[model samples]
Target: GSHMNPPPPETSNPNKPKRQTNQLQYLLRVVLKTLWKHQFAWPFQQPVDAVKLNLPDYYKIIKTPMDMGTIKKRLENNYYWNAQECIQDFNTMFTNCYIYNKPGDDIVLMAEALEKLFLQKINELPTEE
Candidate 1:
């Protein structure tokens, strides 16, 4: 005769949504490649509505007079073409945006999300015994 033990109760947090590992990995890979290759150009020639990106507020904030070229240059200057450095740079960018009340809060969120995904990926890697 055999007896079965019940599975452990689920203890996942209710506030945090389950991570979409695949999507996050895809986004990180694409963005890293673009940044490293200096191909991180704006996706459109003409001004596109940011509402489509779910960031209408940011679009309005940016219209007040931010220099796009200067921002691009700053990003280029700060990047060191390494993953860890890139993550650090993103963190710095986020802090600056928050302090200055910039329109790029989306970038900050994206950076934080990518960093979390990267850490999760590292933890999931197999280690030699």
Candidate 2:
């Protein structure tokens, strides 16, 4: 497979002399191109209701905010630098230990673990005078 860079924009517009595409425009182009290539070229519609429906079954998992960099750093620190080890640890935690009661469902466990771990760490810190 070959990759071709997009052609540079011509600097000759009547309204605007200098034509510059920002990072957001580039990102949007990439996203649109990907969607076009994948045949996901459907128009998006606004939801009828302003309020969104929340699911109770996985609400806790959904509420957890992921720190991807922290997760990666932790894995690297623990000598599990590769994706396989990371995945395996995930598999073991969720599948073997029933951490979240199912494979690929460790958000709840991770959330709880992080809360306890941070609380313990924070408590260990000396109080400011």
Candidate 3:
């Protein structure tokens, strides 16, 4: 099968528009899009409600909350210089869930499912090929 994604031929770094570490941007974007549409993505899409849930310890346990929305915005804002940074952020987000939520809870289960999907999508890319 042929993947017909036309490369946007802007100057690599002719004084504007930062250079990509190959096509990792597009690859991450595709993976993120898939994750955004996943059934288990809803819980991880935004910051948890510590105040609403009355669990002040939530923030205490999970310092520096990482959400998919923040990741998406960061990607769009070019805050990621490499693919590994984005990958680590995803890892951090899932790890936060595992740390805060009790094991086998619905939130933990959803995080597990969504994290599995993330890893699957990420590996499916042509990265390191």
Candidate 4:
């Protein structure tokens, strides 16, 4: 009897991204990745070091501190229940940048570029669940 050389069971596509039950999360992830690698995202990558930057008014004005790093962690941990929560955090980060730095300042310029980019990218993200 010829050995029936049946090809090994076809395993499913292993290259596909891990399935996320929440559609909002899936869409948000795409935008987050873009922001993480954005050219102007450096300034907002980490929490503001008020002490190191020597800004006594930094925390004073910006009561709620937000950053890309923190946001990423929050998303990964499934802290966000909806897209609005994620978008609001981005707003908070940008607001702090605008309030703390002058409009023409380098950090502010970077923030504005990143802010614009965020809006443009987020626009493409469907919030519908």
Best by TM-score: 4
Write one digit per residue (lDDT tens) for candidate 1, span 1-129: 111212221223355333323333432455433433332223311132344555445434443322223323323343223334334434444344454354566554543554454455545533322
In the range 49-115, model 3's lDDT, one tens digit per residue, is 6666667677667766788877776666666567777787888889988888889799899888888
The order by descending TM-score is 4, 3, 1, 2
lDDT measured at residue 56 in model 4 versus the true structure, 0 to 100: 65
**Cα deviation of 79, candidate 1, in Å:** 6.9
Ten contiguous residues with the weakest lDDT in model 1: 1-10
lDDT of 4 by residue, 10-104 (tens): 22334533333354575357777878898888878777766667676776687778888877766775666577777888898899888888878
Scored by lDDT, model 2 comes in at 0.30
Worst 10 residues of 4 by lDDT: 1-10
Q: lDDT of each structure? A: 0.37, 0.30, 0.71, 0.70
- How accurate locally is residue 54 in candidate 2, as Cα lDDT from 0 to 100? 29
Clashes of 3: 0
Native-referenced Cα lDDT, model 1: 0.37
lDDT of 4: 0.70
Q: Report the C-alpha lDDT of model 2 over 26-111, residue by residue, as the tens digit.
A: 22233223322332122111111112332233324322222223233333234332333333332332232233235455444543
Instruction: Show where candidate 3 strays beyond 4 Å.
Output: 1-19
Q: Estimate the TM-score for candidate 4.
A: 0.77
The Cα RMSD of model 4 versus the native structure comes to 16.0
Model 4 segments more than 4 A misplaced: 1-23
Clashes of 1: 0
TM-score of every candidate: 0.25, 0.22, 0.77, 0.77
